[PDB]
Amino acid sequence: SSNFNQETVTDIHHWTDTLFSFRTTRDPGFRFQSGQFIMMGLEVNGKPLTRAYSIASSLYEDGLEFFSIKVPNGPLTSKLQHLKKGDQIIVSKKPVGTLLYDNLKPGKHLWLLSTGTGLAPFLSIIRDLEVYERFEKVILVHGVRQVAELAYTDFISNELPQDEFLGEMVKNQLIYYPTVTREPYKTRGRLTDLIRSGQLFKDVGLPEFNHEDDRMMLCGSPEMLAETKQILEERGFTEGSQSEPGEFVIEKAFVEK
Numbered sequence: 174s175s176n177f178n179q180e181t182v183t184d185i186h187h188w189t190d191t192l193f194s195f196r197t198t199r200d201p202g203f204r205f206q207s208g209q210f211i212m213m214g215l216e217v218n219g220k221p222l223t224r225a226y227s228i229a230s231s232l233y234e235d236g237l238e239f240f241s242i243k244v245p246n247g248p249l250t251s252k253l254q255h256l257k258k259g260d261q262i263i264v265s266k267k268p269v270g271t272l273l274y275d276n277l278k279p280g281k282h283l284w285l286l287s288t289g290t291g292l293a294p295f296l297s298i299i300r301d302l303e304v305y306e307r308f309e310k311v312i313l314v315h316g317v318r319q320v321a322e323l324a325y326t327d328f329i330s331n332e333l334p335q336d337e338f339l340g341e342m343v344k345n346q347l348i349y350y351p352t353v354t355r356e357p358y359k360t361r362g363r364l365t366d367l368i369r370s371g372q373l374f375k376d377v378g379l380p381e382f383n384h385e386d387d388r389m390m391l392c393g394s395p396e397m398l399a400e401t402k403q404i405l406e407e408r409g410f411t412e413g414s415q416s417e418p419g420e421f422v423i424e425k426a427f428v429e430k
């Protein structure tokens with residue numbers, strides 16, 4: 174420790190028995206780029222117990238936010254799930270990751286394709302002025318299994334458009350496309366199935382992906398990332414990196430341990 178900032182919990186919200194969000198203080202020195210992750214967790218017997226977490230908060234916010242799984246036997250989240258306001262967490266000081274605008278070639282459309290907690294980095298990006306300066310449209314796809322897992326659905330649809338700074342850009346440029354596999358909902362099925370049938374493009378009112386206009390960031394389950402990568406690679410889209418801008422970038426929302 175002392176390669177960590179101590180932050181205090183300010184707010185906690187449980188979406189379901191497996192998903193919760195919380196907000197903390199943010200150190201004055203803590204700088205990041207929208208889409209980056211850090212190591213977050215708890216001081217346990219005077220040593221760090223930390224996991225990779227996407228920063229879900231805006232870089233414009235005087236606070237941090239995390240959108241977290243709750244795993245009953247998971248070493249970190251078995252404890253993290255019981256957090257209360259005024260509890261302390263630790264956050265590493267060196268943000269990293271691939272979900273960055275400069276890893277993509279300039280374009281017209283940015284598709285943020287997520288499952289489950291993979292929404293987290295995109296909650297930072299849709300609350301960044303810079304994404305709306307760079308992209309005419311931002312399409313946020315969030316795929317989940319149950320309606321109650323659509324964390325932030327009322328925030329994104331109703332509260333974000335009234336944001337005093339970003340409200341008008343979100344109204345004009347953000348298209349939010351939630352989908353639910355295992356419960357009745359206006360939009361059903363896996364985002365991979367919705368690309369393959371063309372229903373994604375019909376429903377959001379934009380053309381089929383093309384090499385000129387469309388860029389993607391992928392953050393989701395190992396199955397969704399493998400299937401969506403193959404879809405995009407076989408259509409002739411290239412994976413970006415710091416060393417060579419591309420049309421799409423990938424980050425694991427988690428690893429099957």
Ligand SMILES: Cc1cc2nc3c(=O)[nH]c(=O)nc-3n(C[C@H](O)[C@H](O)[C@H](O)COP(=O)(O)OP(=O)(O)OC[C@H]3O[C@@H](n4cnc5c(N)ncnc54)[C@H](O)[C@@H]3O)c2cc1C
Nearest residue numbers: 224225226227241242247248249250290293426427429430
């Ligand atoms: C780059 C990166 C970014 C990440 N960002 C986040 C984030 O923003 N929010 C988040 O909750 N986790 C995130 N994770 C996963 C995270 O690092 C931990 O795995 C998670 O905190 C649970 O840790 P644990 O010690 O309780 O259980 P672990 O021992 O890490 O995992 C136990 C099992 O739970 C499942 N699991 C773990 N994380 C998830 C998850 N997010 N969704 C579904 N199943 C999961 C897997 O089946 C895993 O095999 C990220 C991982 C990576 C590699």
